[PDB]
Symmetry: D3
Subunit: 221 residues, 6 copies
């Protein structure tokens, strides 16, 4: 049994999407996977010697679960997962909804409404038009919005990633008060990934956190 | 700060070892890293759908820490680890000692005695001369002996992997009774890695566990 | 004298633009070059045997100048060209201006205003949100807007490409009336490139021209 | 319709030629294509900044048609072109005829007589045995002789390349007098290609023009 | 007849060997081929300018047959050679036998006994545990033992390599006295290969000959 | 001492040769090495199983010296060899002299006269214009003319290759009469190389020997 020949590592898309919807959805999925890969590489390189890891997960926390989560996002068998462009449950009618998870009956399926193809942004425009990591919402860009959808699936989240803290202040408090549940909080991982990508790639050496902190090379040792 | 050009992913060796000792220690370390990489790949491909994972870690356990540990072994900054061939603590004189960890004063240093160069075997001789995974000691080969030494280092183990169960039957009981602690047990990881390597590479489809179990393709779904 | 070593094929950007502006300007310039390369490949493969060429340039026109223009855009010495973000001529104050050519005193220089970083789209969103090649403006996307700016530079356009027809109907009439002058017309070239890219890549086999014409494989021979 | 998998970029040869004629004809065609490619690259790098372009095409002529002709020779669909080794019109009986074009009834076919396999040289012998570009005939080598045959075919010449000036002095006059017609003159392109190849590859920095001119690095700026 | 598509340069193994026997036999054969390749490269690089060649083959001997032997080992066609783990002659009961050549009736077949899978060592352990090239037997390692069995095969030895000198002193005397038969002597080639490999790879600059001779870079000129 | 970093495998040329002389001589030197490599590959693939080997070296002759001779030409240190275009010994004045060996005082040097640049042919014209291997002279082409010069050098020939037979009939008699000196005869090797190249590449399956022999696939077994 050569299981290396059936290994699917990309997110499948259903046939309910036409050409133009497919073109943008695939690009968004690729950008989300790229963000996850960069986060995993940063974690492997530094660990708890990084101020970002220290402030999002704890001062003396072990980095194995974070690496495992990001590596599961990057490479794993995505054969039961399907992304659809069809409103089967009749829920896109609500005001301000760009998609939803199908629920427990179909725990590996998710729906994308038409607002996503009008409001979501791409990674080349990060930290522009007044955007900051700590003051704006996390679903403005394709990558941070699809990372949130991934955590709800059964093959990726595995029924351990939940919503323990949502605001930036609550996330900072949970980092230092409860480090056991900080590594499985939904918003902490997204904040960490966005911050490290902005610091390493977009504006090298500065980032765009926007809360009054600046980190140098002496903070990494 | 380009930290991608400052990244060290191999285990350094001190100059106390001459050419002959270096030649064999390097090969042993490479074999240990290869075993860790294959274990990571098997975990990422299957998770809790494979019978080996179910029998060593639990029927419905999440595979994040297991991936993280082997990924830390494969890729991480080994800039503070050192392997020495010099008896700095006068402990190779004991009976049957092939090495020791230097302890809390030097948490990233290991010493190798002369017995290892005459007793340790190589991966091409697996499942031969009457060896079985479950009935023989885990330190007969270089890879399984060095995996156990990796778990004591501060940069790899991070003070969470310990000895909760050592015997095969105790490991089997821990897998089903206390699943939270059977992801940070030293012997469970080594048994899992040795069992999944021999089933996939050494004797494809059969393995050499030698306890009375046979698994087919229908058990992986 | 090895002139293959100091051969610059990309478009230089001045230091007046900060990191955020640079990130988007580079992507726009690369997309324009990619569009020109695809147009060149289509022209070389077919010539006057394709309906797009016949309806934009003439039924029996020779395809040499058309190939040469796109080849000059793709590969040539861009050593005297500079793109700036400073308003050195005090012209961005005008309503609806996204940039301007510096003129005959500085024939290889051009200025980009801030409206560009707010209204320009990317190639992954082509033929969406009601966009139509025949009915919309040619400067909605980054690539079509920068191709028009390329024709004004001294080293690319070489003082032969002008404005002979601007609307779609005028271009269509010029194709059949004056074939000698509809090979150095800016709008003709931009329309041709956008049409062939939309037909070949975005919606394979259909395109998004939106004028009531549909071409099959039998029209290419 | 994937037209990139149906693209033919080499010149086909009929089955009339035996094993020995094919071997030499293929090498001749390859050398002609290589010469065209080098001429295209020199034009793309320099334009009207090189003295060779200035002396063959005009002091301030635009380089788009010149690039397009050589690019058409290098890469284009050669699917209806055929080279034959069989006398079908009974014309090889003439004195000094090494081949001919089949005419308007068969606009994409050429015939090669037996003198070609006796009196044609290779690119490794350029500028030797007293040969000069200005004082010798242009059909002495395979590469310069097949380029002249390419201009007569319908899929490459496209009925725009003609004989307006044959001798070297008339070629030099046409460049300064009528630059509109000295871009579609058969002999100007061949002289240009041979001169730039000899200057760049055969004898770097000197060439073998044999006219009385010596160009330095300061002439290219 | 394209004979490049059916060219076999590896030694085939019969299906009478199970998985564990196959795994070790393949590694041994590969190591033997690697040793032969290194010997060929050393001979080509130096010839009679190296002290090892001088001391094993003669002070003024020509090096063509020595190169040809190792090249035949590395890259001749091996489609009629077979290695078997089946005792078809009842010769395993002889004390101390690890294998035997099948004889003149089957001149291209060899049998491997079970004693070989317990005693033979690997190239990573060369010059260790008190081993010296001059004083130990040549069949201690897989490569040296398997090289001696190739000289008996009809496709490799070709009925010209024999046993003229067996001990080290007789080999050293044959090198200086009878140079015409030193290039056809079985033990001389193995001694030469082991010496050059130990000097070049295992202990760079010193080797492990163990007879009191040390060579520097000035002896190679 | 890393001797793989200063390994020279091409034939050096002196500064006494101008640009055109260098251009022609380097190509001539490369063609001979290509021919030698093909001859070595044919010998390794077949040995005495091919009818070309049997007719030039003997029915049951071993093939190691032939392989070594061609391998020394293909890959070996050539740092003491030099080719010159200056007539230092005053010998480029006799009728029909295209070069000469400098003799025992300078045994690694060769002079090339001016007839070589006028008379020698290239491998693309093999078996044409009435050429046959057995009825024409050996030195008509660059490759066969330079293979004869290689055998006189001290670093390649090594004072064992001589002139024992010159005509085709004598060469054929020597193979069956005296097989020990046929493998070190200058003309036998060149005849064998030319024959196998013409049979394998120039006219696949037929060759151009021109003596009334035809070999099929059944002859190679
Ligand atoms: Zn959620
Ligand atoms: Zn322990
Ligand atoms: Zn304009
Ligand atoms: Zn003509
Ligand atoms: Zn023997
Ligand atoms: Zn001679």
């Amino acid at each position: 049994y050569d299981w290396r020949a059936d290994w699917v590592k990309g997110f499948p898309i259903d046939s309910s999407c036409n050409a133009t919807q497919y073109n943008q959805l695939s690009t968004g999925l690729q950008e989300a996977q790229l963000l996850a890969e960069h986060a995993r590489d940063h974690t492997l390189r530094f660990g708890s010697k990084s101020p970002f890891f220290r402030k999002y997960f704890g001062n003396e926390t072990a980095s194995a679960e974070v690496v495992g989560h990001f590596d599961n996002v990057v490479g794993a068998d995505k054969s039961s997962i399907l992304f659809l462009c069809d409103d089967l449950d009749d829920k896109c009618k609500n005001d301000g909804w760009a998609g939803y998870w199908r629920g427990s009956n179909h725990s590996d399926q998710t729906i994308i409404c038409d607002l996503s193809f009008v409001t979501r942004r791409y990674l080349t425009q990060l930290c522009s038009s007044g955007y900051t990591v700590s003051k704006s919402k996390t679903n403005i860009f394709w990558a941070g919005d699809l990372l949130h959808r991934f955590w709800h699936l059964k093959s990726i989240g595995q029924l351990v990633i939940e919503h323990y803290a949502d605001t930036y202040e609550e996330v900072l408090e949970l980092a230092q008060e409860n480090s056991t549940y900080a590594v499985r909080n939904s918003n902490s991982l997204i904040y960490y990934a966005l911050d490290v990508y902005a610091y390493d790639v977009t504006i090298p050496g500065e980032g765009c956190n926007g809360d009054g902190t600046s980190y140098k090379k002496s903070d990494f040792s």
